[PDB]
Amino acid sequence: YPCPNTVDCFVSRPTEKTVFTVFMLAASGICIILNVAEVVYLIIRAC
Amino acid sequence: YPCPNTVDCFVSRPTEKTVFTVFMLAASGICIILNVAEVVYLIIRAC
């Protein structure tokens, strides 16, 4: 509301935004894996 | 087509047009009944 029925809307630069989303998500996933590896190394250092 | 999805459209003077439609349909129905009566009278005149 208040759009009548269903309306079409158009997104700005969807392809470029998709590319940058892939880059940022890949970097975040690398960060996650690296943080797990660092925690495991700390545990090994404790033992 | 080519209207996207479903669109709302607005009719000009719907109430006045309805009134005149009722008048014309009533007159046409009266004409139909009267024509049947005239045919029946002609048949009776034949007999």
From Swiss-Prot, chains A, B:
Changing P2R: In CMTX1; suggests a failure to incorporate the mutant protein in the cell membrane. Changing E16K: In CMTX1; non-functional channel. It comes from the Eukaryota. The chain crosses the membrane at residues 22-44. It is found in: Cell membrane; Cell junction, Gap junction. Changing V11A: In CMTX1; profoundly impaired in their ability to support the earliest stages of regeneration of myelinated fibers. One gap junction consists of a cluster of closely packed pairs of transmembrane channels, the connexons, through which materials of low MW diffuse from one cell to a neighboring cell. It is linked to Charcot-Marie-Tooth disease, X-linked dominant, 1: A form of Charcot-Marie-Tooth disease, a disorder of the peripheral nervous system, characterized by progressive weakness and atrophy, initially of the peroneal muscles and later of the distal muscles of the arms. Belongs to the connexin family. Beta-type (group I) subfamily. A connexon is composed of a hexamer of connexins. Interacts with CNST. This is Gap junction beta-1 protein. It comes from Homo sapiens (Human). The gene is GJB1.
